[PDB]
């Protein structure tokens, strides 16, 4: 829903964790302002020079423990956005949620990846929230809130990563 637009923006590991993994009131998600990096990522049959940046972060259900009383454990899923340069010709259908963008004869592949973080929080069932699903996150973050044609929306990639050795691997 349009609840996605209401989500605030966070910057830095502890700010993202601090906002989401709140025991008193756990939060569904937040947008992430992050650094763009450049390096090889394997998709399909080979490696592609890929631009990567965090874009969103959301709470994920770990477990529900028994008692005296009913407790709920949450984890943070960090969502990254990628531009796998030249990958769009052979991997246009590799992901359920993806976009293609032409740069001359070259076809870039725009997709999202999720990384589960280690930090967890124990919340009582009375304070528990309904977590967002990976399908909804991809639809709102990439499909509805990012335009590869103009590199704009709720986020944009910093292409200067290609020229920064600190942001290259």
């Amino acid at each position: 829903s349009g609840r996605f637009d209401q989500y605030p923006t966070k910057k830095g590991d502890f700010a993202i964790d601090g906002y989401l993994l709140d025991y008193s009131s756990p939060k569904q998600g937040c947008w992430v302002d992050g650094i763009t990096v450049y390096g090889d990522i394997y998709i399909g049959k080979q490696n592609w020079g890929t631009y990567t940046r965090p874009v969103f972060a959301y709470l994920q259900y770990v477990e529900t423990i028994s008692g005296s009383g009913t407790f709920v454990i949450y984890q943070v899923v960090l969502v990254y956005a990628h531009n796998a340069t030249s990958a769009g010709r052979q991997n246009a259908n590799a992901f359920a949620y993806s976009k293609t963008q032409a740069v001359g004869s070259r076809v870039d592949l725009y997709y999202l990846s999720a990384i589960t973080q280690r930090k967890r929080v124990i919340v009582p069932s009375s304070n528990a929230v309904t977590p967002l699903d990976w399908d909804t996150v991809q639809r709102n973050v990439l499909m509805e809130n990012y335009n590869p044609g103009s590199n704009s929306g709720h986020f944009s990639f910093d292409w200067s990563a290609y020229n920064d050795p600190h942001r290259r691997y």
Binding site: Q46, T85, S86
Partner: peptide, 9 residues
């Protein structure tokens, strides 16, 4: 415009 070093096949 995004720069690339990617080599197909």
């Amino acid at each position: 415009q995004p720069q690339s070093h990617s080599i197909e096949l």
